Amino acid sequence: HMQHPSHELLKEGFTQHVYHKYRRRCLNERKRLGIGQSQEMNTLFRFWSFFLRDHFNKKMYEEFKQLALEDAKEGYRYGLECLFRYYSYGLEKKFRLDIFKDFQEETVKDYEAGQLYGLEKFWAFLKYSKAKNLDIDPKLQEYLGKF
Ligand SMILES: CN1CN([C@@H]2O[C@H](COP(=O)(O)OP(=O)(O)OP(=O)(O)O)[C@@H](O)[C@H]2O)c2nc(N)[nH]c(=O)c21
């Protein structure tokens, strides 16, 4: 009875009706309380991080990425941490060429912002994934070399 919506939606479990109401409440809280001030919004970031690993959808991924980056620019990094976990674990489970390009792009940005959370997640993807013949950004290769 006390199931959080994100827990219900992540069960083998997702319906549009439950997700619509949940997403709307989270976004409304982010708008009212402010970026980085809503713990409900944090549960939505976490939901996306896991849900997209098994049920990718382009528009949901794009919203996740956009809001995670907006939060991170203001200094609130949980969304982006969730996004890097999605990249590293999600692309290991099923490689996606377009999403991998985004993974490289956001890792480069994160490293150039003086963070290493993203770079470690990219390194981890390379250590765990069976993907071969990756076309890795030569600047990212330099960053990984020092890691
Ligand atoms: C199980 N893990 C762990 N991991 C990433 O790998 C990095 C190092 O964590 P770890 O591999 O769990 O350390 P590990 O040596 O296994 O733990 P321990 O030394 O206690 O035995 C973390 O950035 C973490 O997010 C992973 N990354 C991907 N893509 N897939 C995975 O299954 C895993």
Numbering used by the authors: 794 to 805, 807 to 941
Sentences copied from the publication:
Recently, we and others identified La-related protein 1 (LARP1) as a novel downstream target of mTORC1 and proposed that it plays an important role in the translation of TOP mRNAs. We have also shown that LARP1 associates with the 5’TOP motif via a LARP1 family-specific ‘DM15 region’ located within its C-terminus. We show that the DM15 region of LARP1 specifically binds the 7-methylguanosine 5’−5’ triphosphate (m7Gppp) moiety and the invariant first cytidine of TOP mRNAs. Biochemical analyses reveal that LARP1 selectively prevents the binding of eIF4E to the m7Gppp cap to block the assembly of the eIF4F complex on TOP mRNAs.
The conservation of the residues interacting with m7GTP in addition to the nucleotide-specific recognition of G8* and C1 from the DM15-RNA and DM15-m7GTP co-crystal structures suggest the DM15 region of LARP1 specifically recognizes the m7GpppC motif. To test this hypothesis, we determined the crystal structure of DM15 bound to m7GpppC dinucleotide. Indeed, this dinucleotide binds the DM15 region in the cap- and C-binding pockets. (D) Superimposition of DM15 bound to RNA and bound to m7GpppC. Finally, thermal shift stability assays demonstrate the interaction of DM15 with m7GTP and m7GpppC is increasingly stabilizing to the DM15 fold; notably, the m7GpppG dinucleotide does not impart additional stability to DM15 over m7GTP. Together with the conservation of the residues interacting with m7GTP, the base-specific hydrogen bonding of the Watson-Crick faces of nucleobases of G8* and C1 in the DM15-RNA co-crystal structure and the recognition of the m7GpppC dinucleotide in the DM15-m7GpppC co-crystal structure, these data suggest the DM15 region of LARP1 specifically recognizes the m7GpppC motif characteristic of TOP mRNAs. Furthermore, these data provide a molecular mechanism by which LARP1 differentiates TOP mRNAs from all other cellular mRNAs, most of which have a purine in the +1 position.
